[PDB]
Homo-oligomer: A and B are copies of this chain.
Amino acid sequence: HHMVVALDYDNRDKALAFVDRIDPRDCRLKVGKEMFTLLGPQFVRDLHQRGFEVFLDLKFHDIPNTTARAVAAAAELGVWMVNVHASGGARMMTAAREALLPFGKDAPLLIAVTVLTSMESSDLQDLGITLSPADYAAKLAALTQRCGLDGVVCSAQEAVRFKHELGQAFKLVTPGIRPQGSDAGDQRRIMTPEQAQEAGVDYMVIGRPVTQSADPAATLRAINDSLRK
């Protein structure tokens, strides 16, 4: 499947009120920094007990030793996917990949964030980066692949280029998904679900356009219908 719904609530009951209205065939679920800081690993158990596979989206970005132990702790949790920041460096990503060797085929997918979907060219200029978001993401994606990771988090606007330069096997997870007529918010490098599918995206992450609608389950089912067709 392709759809991943971001559970970005500030309340455990509110999140579970939505999850109890949907089915694991509808999507996988993403647990991010907000809900994990409030609830910790028990929330991952809450979703597993309900039959969902979980993308643990904590974007580990630390020294190699710390990043490796954090990724191993995520693997002990049994999640479907976990990610790191590619701008954490090659030694960091390699330590992360080696930390998953003890878990064999049960290890989670190991993804690296390239350039966050909220960052535009002016955002990177404050950091001294002169490359466009696409070019910098491309550089970070190639480094991630060369370090042996399974794929990258990127904007859907980079999918066609990444699939062609890095191959079909390298997995692309794209947030910054916005249907026609939904507020962009802090997102910048965006694409409709239909546009992201055409680009070759493997997994599309959607949050606020689903979780903040008058009927989140129907919105999610409506998007899935548009892509399955």
Give residues in A with beta carbon < 8 Å to B: 8, 10, 32-34, 36-42, 58-67, 69-70, 72-74, 76-77, 85, 87-92, 95, 116-119, 123-124, 126-129, 131, 136, 139-140, 143, 185-187
Contact = CB atoms under 8 A, between A and B. Distances in A.
Give the oligomeric copy count: 2
A136 B24 CA distance: 45
Contact of A38 (B41, B61, B63, B126): B41
List the 4 closest A-B pairs by CB distance, nearest first: A40-B40, A33-B70, A63-B118, A37-B73
A49 to B, nearest CB: 16
Contact of A69 (B8, B61, B66, B95): B8
A169 to B, nearest CB: 22
Contacts of A136: 128
A159 to B, nearest CB: 19
A201 to B, nearest CB: 18
Contact of A65 (B42, B64, B186): B186
B126 A90 contact: yes
A127 B115 CA distance: 12
Contacts of A124: 89
